[PDB]
Design a protein around this nucleic acid. Sequence first.
DNA 1: ATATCTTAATTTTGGTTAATA
DNA 2: TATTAACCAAAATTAAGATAT
Lengths: 220, 222
Amino acid sequence: MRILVIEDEISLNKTIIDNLNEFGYQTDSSENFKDGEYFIGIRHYDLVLASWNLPDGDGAELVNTIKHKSPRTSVMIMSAKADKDTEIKALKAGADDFVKKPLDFDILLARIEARLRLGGTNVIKIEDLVIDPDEEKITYKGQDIELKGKPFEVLTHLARHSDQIVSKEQLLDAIWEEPELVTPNVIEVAINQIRQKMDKPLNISTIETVRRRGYRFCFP
Amino acid sequence: MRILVIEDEISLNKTIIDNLNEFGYQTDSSENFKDGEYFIGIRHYDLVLASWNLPDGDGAELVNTIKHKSPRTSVMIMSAKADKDTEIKALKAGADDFVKKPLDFDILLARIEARLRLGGTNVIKIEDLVIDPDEEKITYKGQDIELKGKPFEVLTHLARHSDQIVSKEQLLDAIWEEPELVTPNVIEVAINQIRQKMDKPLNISTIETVRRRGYRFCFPKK
DNA sequence: ATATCTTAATTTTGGTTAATA
DNA sequence: TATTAACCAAAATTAAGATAT
């Protein structure tokens, strides 16, 4: 999952990115609405962390622009003014969460994880398939599967986004630090790794390929 | 601190106790050497203050006994005989100190504090794991683990920077000398011995490696 | 034709094992 | 012992051809 930060204050923007990266997220920062708006046009972000109090934005337009271009991107607003009405304006403007500044980073990461779970649970438990992304483990029928690294991350991403196709660019954007540089075959070798150690041996078809579209996780 | 008072005079013994509790010492009292030894068997007292003059009058036989049964305990002897011989013959009997009566409870309290001061320890202790850097002793749940040499110092530096991560270079500059003339693999072979000796038989990750970051001590278990 | 799938080589990054200063 | 050399395992990544659409 890729997070984007738009903090006008220089020090805060940094601290946030460092904490987020430590957790396990891919990250890009912005200090401007214009600079932000460019990023959201080149890359896909799973969540955007923006300040309502920016010099070059009203907040409400910021939240509106992003949720129009990237309609599946989540918007979390941060404000030093956590007033009742400031919050309501943000949420009404299309924000998905509102947090007060100064920040509790332990609570932020929890909400970020909840927002990227897509309504799911932390441990993804479909049938006898159990993917614990936190301990990096996949178990089917009590039997353990051995998938690790990027290849495991596209599987959880494909599972968080089940019954939906995910373009190779989004998998790149979500999991690789510099998605533009890596060749898009990294994604295909990963899917082969997954299928080889899951779909092929366990007589199943978890991932489906859709030409000029992407891949789609299924468990029918 | 637990101090034991063996005094024949009840007057004083109550006074000795009252001042000693006022300072925050656990304190038990007696008037019989027999009684004293009993407490010793059941509990460990950091110090025992006792009168040189008692009905028993065993003298050294008291100091030598207390030390024999419980050697980590100190013996301070109280007497109203101030003669040099009394003092000397008592200290030569094993007394760690000789105070005089009439008693100056102010001095008395200061001297007990000095006989009980522990000082500074470099020992690191976590759960069942204790790391004694001065004795080169790593014991887990009473089970000495055989880590020695640079591996030991590497483990120490990490523990001292627990949670935090230490670069291979930091470890090199600290534990090793002239880091410009050592193969960095020395750290890998060090972490291996560390894991091979402790992390493994202890069945709990001791050290964790972080990509391009190095290692950080991680003991969040038994 | 393109699109991707597989398999292989290569690179990176520590971990392991002995031997030998 | 402490230091090294050789060796292993793993991920990453890119390449190439194969195979499917």
